[PDB]
Amino acid sequence: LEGVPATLSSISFVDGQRGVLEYRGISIEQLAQQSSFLETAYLLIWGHLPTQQELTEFEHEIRYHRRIKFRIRDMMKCFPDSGHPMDALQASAAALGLFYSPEYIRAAVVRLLAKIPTMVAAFQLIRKGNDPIQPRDELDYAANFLYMLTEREPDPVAARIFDICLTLHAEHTINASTFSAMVTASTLTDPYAVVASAVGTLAGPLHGGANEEVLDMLEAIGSVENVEPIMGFGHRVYKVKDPRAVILQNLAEQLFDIFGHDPYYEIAVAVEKAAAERLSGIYPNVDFYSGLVYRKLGIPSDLFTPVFAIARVAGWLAHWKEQLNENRIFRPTQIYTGSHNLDYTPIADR
Amino acid sequence: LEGVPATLSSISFVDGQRGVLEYRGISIEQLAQQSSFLETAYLLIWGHLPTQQELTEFEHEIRYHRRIKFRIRDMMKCFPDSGHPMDALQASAAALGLFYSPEYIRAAVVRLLAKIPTMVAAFQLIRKGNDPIQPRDELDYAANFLYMLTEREPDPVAARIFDICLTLHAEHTINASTFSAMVTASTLTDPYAVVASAVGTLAGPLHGGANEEVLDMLEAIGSVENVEPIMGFGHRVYKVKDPRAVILQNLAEQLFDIFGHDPYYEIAVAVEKAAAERLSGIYPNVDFYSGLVYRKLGIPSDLFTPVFAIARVAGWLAHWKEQLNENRIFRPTQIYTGSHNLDYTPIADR
Amino acid sequence: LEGVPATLSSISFVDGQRGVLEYRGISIEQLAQQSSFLETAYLLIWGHLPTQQELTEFEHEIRYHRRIKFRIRDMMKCFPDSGHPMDALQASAAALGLFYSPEYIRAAVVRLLAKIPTMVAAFQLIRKGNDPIQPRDELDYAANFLYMLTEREPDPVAARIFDICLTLHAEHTINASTFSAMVTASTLTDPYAVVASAVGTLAGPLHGGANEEVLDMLEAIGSVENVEPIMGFGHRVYKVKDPRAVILQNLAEQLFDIFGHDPYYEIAVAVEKAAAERLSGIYPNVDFYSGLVYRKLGIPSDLFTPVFAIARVAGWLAHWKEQLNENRIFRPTQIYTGSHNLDYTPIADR
Amino acid sequence: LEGVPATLSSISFVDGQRGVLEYRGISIEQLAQQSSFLETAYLLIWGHLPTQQELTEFEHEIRYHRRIKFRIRDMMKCFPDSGHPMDALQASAAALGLFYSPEYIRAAVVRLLAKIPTMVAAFQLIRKGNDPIQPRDELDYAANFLYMLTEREPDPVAARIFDICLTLHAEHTINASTFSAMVTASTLTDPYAVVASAVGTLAGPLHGGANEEVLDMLEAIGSVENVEPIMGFGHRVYKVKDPRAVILQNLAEQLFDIFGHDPYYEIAVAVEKAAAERLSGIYPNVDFYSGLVYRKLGIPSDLFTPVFAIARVAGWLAHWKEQLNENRIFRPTQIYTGSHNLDYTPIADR
Amino acid sequence: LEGVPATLSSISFVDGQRGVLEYRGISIEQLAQQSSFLETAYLLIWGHLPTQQELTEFEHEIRYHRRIKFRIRDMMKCFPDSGHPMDALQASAAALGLFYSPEYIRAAVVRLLAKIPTMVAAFQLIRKGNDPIQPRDELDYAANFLYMLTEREPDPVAARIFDICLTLHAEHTINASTFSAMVTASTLTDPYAVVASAVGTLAGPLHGGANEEVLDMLEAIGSVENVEPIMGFGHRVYKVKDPRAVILQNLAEQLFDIFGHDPYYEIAVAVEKAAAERLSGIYPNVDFYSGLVYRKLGIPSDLFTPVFAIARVAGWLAHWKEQLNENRIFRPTQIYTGSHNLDYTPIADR
C-alpha cells in the first residue's frame, strides 16, 4: 500500500532529503527547547498553542485524573507475572473502556493521557510483587512517572530530559500503528479501542523494537577495545541526518556529564566514533541514544516500548480527532486470485 | 396507634402550640449556640451534661474507634454499585454485630457513634470505584466526616455549621423509627440490631425523604422568574413555627454569605418570600433548608437520608438505654375479623 | 402496650381457653395432616387455598430462585467465623435488598422464601470452613434444605416431619417480631428491610430462645435415674394444652420409633412423665419437642432459632402484605416525665 | 554422628549383607504381594495387622477426610506459579497446623494421610492455572490420587502398581529426614510441624533427588545405539541386591507389557543390560525404576519427590508415635574449638 | 543422645560452673554494654566484628528489605484468626522459600533478618482484624519492630532495652532447635526450610515456653501479701548464676524506674526476695525477667515465643553457615528391638 496518498493530514510534516520535522508547521527544535510534553500534546491535538489559562486548566485536569480506580489495580493483580508489558498495556487500555466509555473529546483525551503512564508503572510494580505507588499532586508529568517507576523523586534535570525525550517521540509521521488507529477510528468508535488497537499494532515482533538490541550488541562488545575487533544505525526516510537524533545525543551527553559517565556510554561512544568514520548515507538514529537515556534514568529494558507508547498516545489521539471529522470507512477493494465454480466433495470421497 | 401514651420518657419534650423543643429540659437554642454534637449526644444518652474530664475521655474514645476493620471494607467492596446507600447502611449496621456483639453500654455507644459515619463515607467512596479515605486523628467529628466524604479538609465555619445541623437533627420525638427501635430493644437484644431495624424503618418509600424533592421542585422552577408563573412547607406538629427551622435558616444564610451565593439559593429565596406572603398556618420546615445546607457542603443528594441517620443514632441509642431498664415486651392484643370453623378442602375439589 | 387492640387482622386466630389455633379460619390439625409448608404459606399470604395450576406455578417459581448470586456467597466468605447465625441472617437479609430491591409483591415473596434457607445453610457450611452446597431441583423445600445442611439426601419420612414442623411454626399470633415487622412496613418500605428488622427483633437475648436450654437441662440430668433426684413447660396463652404441642409430640414419637430411640429421648420421656404427674395448669409446650425433633434431623443447636425464622418468614410476609393496604404510620403519643425550662450551664461551671 | 546407636526402634529392620527389609518383622515381599498401602501404614504406625472392622473403619475415615477447606485452596491460589512443589508442600503442611492443631493421635494420622496427596494434586493443578479437582468417594487412595493428578480415572492395574510402589517407598530406615522428624517430635509438638520439618529436610539440594537425573541421562543418550558409545546404580547399604529393586523392576515390566512399550523404556533396558555385564558390587536401585514407573503413570518429573513424601508420611508418623512414649529431648554436647577470653574492640579502632 | 560430642563449633561457649557465656570468645557483658543486635548478629554469623563501612552496608541492606510483598500479606489474610502465632510464623517462613529460594549466603541472611519481625507484626495486626503497619526507614531494628507492633513510636530507652534483650537471647548453645536446624541444613537445603524446621521445633508443647507461666503464677498470687501465704527459677546448666539474668534484671529495674512501677513488678519483687532467702543452687533465670520486660514494652503474652524466635534467627543462621562447610549428613545407626522372620496373616484369619 506504500505510495498511495490515502490520508490528507495537516498534523506533522517530514522531509527526509532536508532533515526537517515539524509539528503543525513548528520545527522540532523549537518545541524541544522552549516547550514541554503537555503543551506539545495540546498543540498536536487541538492545532494551536494553548494560552496561559488553557495550559493551566489542561495541567490541572491531567493531574486530577492521574489516579486509577481500585478495580483496575485488582485486575492487574490477576495478570500473570510472566506476561509481557505490551500485552498488559493493551489489556488495561481495553479495560479503560469498560469504565469510561462536545465534552467527550476533551474528557477522553485527559483521562487517557493521565492514566496510561499510571497503569504502566502499576504493572511494572505489580509484576515484581510490590504494591503500586500512588501519584503525587506536587510533581509534574515526567517527574511523577519517574517517581512511580522508581519510588524515588527524580532530579529536575532528569525530569526535563525525560520530558524532552517524550516530546521528541510524541509523533513522527503516518506508519503502521497510526494507520491502524485511523482504521479503527473510521468506524466512530471510542478512543480507548483505538488506543488498544494502536498498542497491539505497535507491539510488533518479540513485543519490542530495536531499542534493546542496541544494548544487546553493546553488552556483546563488552569493552572499549572490542568495538573494532547493523541495528542502531541508518533510517528509511532521512538521508542527511535524523533531526531528532542530534537533540537526543545532546541530551544524553548533558545528562551523562551531569550524572557521571558509565561504562556502557563509553562503549557507545567508542562504537559510534568508529562507525561515523567508515560508514558515512549511514548515520545513527534515535534508537541508539534512546536506550542509553532511558537506562540512565532507571527505566528497565523491557519497558522501553511501553514508554514509547506513552509518548505516542498524544499522536494517535490527534490522528483520531482528525479522522473523526473526515468520517469515511476504510473500505478498499481486492482482486481474486483463486479457483472458481468448484463444488463440495463428500468427506468419505476425500 | 396514634394517641396512645405507650411510652414514659424523660428524654425530649415537644410543644407544637408554643414552638418549644427541649433535650432533657434544655431548649434547642441553648444547645445550638453553646454546644457541640458529641456533648449533646452525651446529654441525651446519659441525662446530664458531661464534665471536662468526661467530655475529653468521650472524645478520645470516639476518635480512637473511628477506624473500621479491613473485613468490613472488603464486605463493602462486594456490595453492588447500583445499591441504595440506605440498604448498604443497614447491611453494615447488621454486620457490625457480627464482630462487636456495665461497660457494654459505653463501648457499644462509642463504637456505633465512631463507626457509622465512617462506613457511610466508605460506601460513598467505594460506590464510585474509589478507595475509602482513612480518618484523621487531628480533625473532629464533623470535620473528619466532611474530609472523608470530599477528600478535602473543610473550612472550620463549614464544620461548625455541619455540627450544629447534626445537633438539630439529633432527635425530635417519638416516631416510627424510634418506636421500631424500642420494640426491637424490648427483647434485650444488642444495640447493633436495634440500629439496623431503626435504619430499615427510616429508609421509607423510595429510600429517601422530602429533602431531595425540594431540590427537584427548585430545579423544575429553574429561575428566579418562574416561582410565581407542597413539599418543603408545613408540619404536622408545630402551628406557629418550627424552632429548628429558624436556626437552620440562620445557619444557611451565614454559610452562604461567607461562602458566596449560589443560583439555587436565589430560587429558594424567591420561592420562600412568595410562599410566606400568600400561605401564612403554613410555614417552611427543616426539610427546606437542610437540603440547601447539605448541598452547599458538598454532600450528594442520595446521601441526605444517611446523614440524617448519622444524626439520629444518638437519639435511638438514648431511647435504647432507657427502654432497657423498663424491660417490657411490646405484646399488644388483636381482634379477629375473619371466618371461623371452616375445614380444609381437597386440592382436586377447588 | 399489652391489651391495646392496635391491629385488625384476619390472618390467624388463637383461643387459649379452648386450645384453638386457626390459619385464616382453618384449624392447625387440618393443615398439619393434609397440607405442606408451601401451600400453607400461600394460604397465609393470599388468604385462599391455591388451585392445582397456582400451586405448581408457585412451587416452580420457588424452586427456580433457590440459587443465590456468587456475590452473596463472597460476602458470606468475609463474615467472621465466630459470629452468631442470627447476626449473619440479619446481614444477609439486609444485603438481599442491595440486589433485589403488581408483580412486586409476588416476586419479593418467592425470592425471600426461596433464598432464606439457602443463605442459612450457606453460612452454616462456610462457618466451619466448607464450601456451600448448591440446591438440587429434584428435591422439594424441606428435603433440599436438609440436603444443603447435611450434604446427604434425607429420608422422605424425615422431610415430611420437617415440613409439618415448619407448618406448625409458620405463624402463631401478634408478638414482638410481628409488631416490629408491621411497624417497619407501615412506612411503605421494601420487604427485605421488614424481614431484617423482624429477624433482629427475633434474635432476642443471647441470640437464642428456650429451645436449647431444654437440651441443656436434659444433658445436666444426664440419666433416666436423675430426673427425680422450669424451661420447657408452661405457656402464657393456652390453659388446657398447646394444640401444636400434641402434633409435635406425635411427630417426634413417630420419627424416633422409625429411626430408633436415642438416650436423650429416654431422658426427655422420663422427665416429662414425672412432670405430668406432679405439676398438672402446667403442660409442656413446643419448646420441648422442637429441640428433640430438630436434633434428631441433624440440625445443630445454635441453628434452632434461624430455622424457626425460616418458618416465620411466611407469617411476617403475610402481615406485611396486609399492613400495606392499611397504610398508617405507627405514630403513638408520649407523656413527658422530666424537668422543664432549665438552661445550659458552662462546662467550666460544672 | 554415623555409627552412634542413638535410637531404639522396633519398626523396621534392614540387612544389607543379606538383602533383607522387614516392616515390623514382616518381609517386604509379603506386603508387596498381599497388602495395600493403607494396611501397611496401619501396621507401621500401630504395630499390628488391622482386623476387618478396623481396616474398614480406617479406610472410611481416610476417605471422609480427603477434602480440604476452601481457605487452604485460597492460600494455594496465592502461591507463586514459579515456586517449587516441595516448598509448597512444606507451606501447606505448616498451614494444616493453623487449622487442625487419646483420640489426638488417630485424628491427626488420618487427617494427614487423607490430605497430603490432596494438597499435592491441588498445587499441581493450580500451578498451571487450572482449578483443583475434588476427590471422589468411589475411588481408593492411589486411584483417587491419580484421578486428581490427571483428571482421568486410572486403570485398576495402574492403581495397583502405584499402590505397591507407595508401599515399597513407605519407609526404609533411619535417615536424615526421619532423624529430623524425631528431633522435632522430642519436644512434644504437633505432628504437622514434624511433617513440615521432615519435608524440609527431604527437599535436599535442588529440591529433588536422583530420580530425575536418571531420566536426564536417558534423554542424553537418546537412542538404543548410544548406550555404549553413575547415578541410577549402586547403594550405600545393600551389597547383594536391593530387595525393593526386584519388585520395582517386575512391576515396571508388567505395567509396560500391559500398557505397551515406550522408547525410554527401551533405552533403559539397553543401558541396564550393558551395565549389568561390565560393572557387576554395582547394581541398579529403586531410583532407576521409580522414575520410569512414575512417568508411565503420567506423573510429572518435578513431582517425583513430593510423591515419595506422600509414601514417607506413614513412616515419619510411625517414628513420631514411638518417639512420643520415649520422651527425651535430643540434647547432645559440643566441644569448643575457638578463642577464649578476648574483649570487645571499639568500632573506630577496627 | 545427651553427652555425645556430635558437633565441633567455635560460635559460642558456655561454662555453667563459672557463669561464663561468650559469643565467639567475647563475653556477653561486653556485647550487652557496647554492642547492638545487628552487630552481634554479624559477629555470630561471620565470626569477626564488622568495620564501619561493613556495618553501615549491613544496616542499609537490612532496612531496604524490611518490606514484604503483597502476596505474603494476602496469604496472611487467609490465615485463621484462631491459629497460634507459632504456626503462622512457621507457615510464613516456609512461604518465604516459595519466593526467595557466593552472594546467596548474604542475601538470604539479610532477607530473613529483615522480614521475620515484619511478618510477626503483620500476623499480630491481621489476627485482630487490623491492617498491617508498614515499616519506616527512619527507625532502626528494635524501634521499627515496636512501632509495627504497637502503631506508636517507642521511647529510645525502650528501644535500647529491647535491643539488649534481643542480643541476650540471640544464642545460648546447642539445643533441640539448633540440632534440628543443623540436621535440616546437612542436606544442603535453603535456609528458609532450616528456619521453618527450627521454628517448628521451638514451638514445643502448648506452642509456648515458661515465659507466660511465670505471669500466670504472678496473677494467681494477685497481691504483695500472698507471696508467702517452681517455674521461673533454676536452670539445667549454670550453678552459680545465669550471666544473662543479672543483665536482664538490671535492664528491667532501669526500665521500670524510668517508666514508673507497676503492680505486677511489685509482686515479682515480693516473690523473688522471698525465694532468694529460702531456696538459695536455686536462682531466678531469664524466664522470670523476660516476661516482665516484654509486657512492659507492650508485647502480648502469646507473642513471647515468636519474639524469642526473632532473636534466635541470627543464631540458627550462624549454625547453618558453619554446618554448610562441614557437609555431613546426620545418619546415625539404630538397634532393632522387635520380632524377626514372621509372615503375613490373611485378614479373615485375624
Residue numbers in the entry:
A (entry chain D), B (entry chain C), C (entry chain E), D (entry chain B), E (entry chain A): 11 to 111, 118 to 245, 257 to 307, 310 to 379
Lines from the paper:
Here we report the discovery of a natural protein, citrate synthase from the cyanobacterium Synechococcus elongatus, which self-assembles into Sierpiński triangles. Bacterial citrate synthase (CS) proteins are homo-oligomeric enzymes that can assemble into dimers and hexamers. CS catalyses the condensation of acetyl-CoA and oxaloacetate to citrate as the first step in the tricarboxylic acid cycle. Using cryo-electron microscopy, we reveal how the fractal assembles from a hexameric building block.
An interaction between the residue E6 from one monomer and H369 of the other establishes an important contact, and mutating either E6 or H369 to alanine or deleting amino acids 2–6 (Δ2–6 SeCS) abolishes the formation of fractals. To understand how this interface forms, we compared the geometry of a variant that could only assemble into hexamers (Δ2–6 SeCS) to that of a hexamer within the 18mer. We extracted a hexamer from the 18mer structure, aligned its free corner dimer onto one dimer of Δ2–6 SeCS and then compared the positions of the two unaligned dimers between the structures. This analysis revealed that the two dimers engaging in fractal connections undergo a small clockwise rotation relative to their conformation within a free hexamer, which subtly breaks the D3 symmetry of the hexameric building block within the fractal. Comparing this structure to the one of a free hexamer (Δ2–6 SeCS) revealed that the CS dimers within the hexamer undergo an anticlockwise rotation after binding to citrate. This rigid-body rotation is well known from other CS enzymes. It takes place following substrate binding and pushes CS from an open conformation (which corresponds to the conformation in the Δ2–6 SeCS structure) into a closed form in which catalysis takes place.
